[PDB]
């Protein structure tokens, strides 16, 4: 799959992901591409905040889904 991550400005980035990828794995991919520590990342899907120890499948996130990246720290 691919998914879309929108910053606060609306700057879109595309991520290559797997259905069984954890939120930590997604945070780690955003760190690789944008240099933000996972610690400082808040990820939001359909107004819901995604939590570590859960998969994209757990939250029903499918191909071409859109996550909102917000800064926590």
Numbering used by the authors: 1 to 73
What did the published study say regarding this structure?
Ubiquitin is a hub of the cellular interaction network. Previous work has shown that free ubiquitin consists of an ensemble of conformations, including the “bound-like” conformations seen in ubiquitin complexes, thus supporting conformational selection as the binding mechanism. We apply our framework to analyze the binding of the paradigmatic protein ubiquitin7 to its partner protein, the SH3c domain of CIN85. The interaction of ubiquitin and the SH3c domain is weak and transient (with dissociation constant Kd = 370 ± 15 μM from NMR titrations), akin to many other biologically important interactions.
The population shift can be calculated from the ratio of the dissociation constants for the “in” and “out” conformations and, thus, from the ratio of KdG53(D)T and KdG53A. The binding-induced population shift of the peptide-flip motion in our Markov state model is also small, in agreement with the mutational data. Besides the peptide-flip mode, an independent and similarly slow motion in our simulations and Markov modeling involves the flexible C-terminal tail of ubiquitin. Our Markov model constructed from 1.68 ms of binding simulations indicates that the population of the compact C-terminal conformation is strongly reduced during binding, and that this population reduction occurs prior to the transition state of binding, which is a clear signature of conformational selection. Unlike the extended C-terminal conformation, the compact conformation sterically obstructs binding of SH3c to ubiquitin. Consequently, the extended conformation of the C-terminus likely is the sought-after ubiquitin conformation selected for binding.
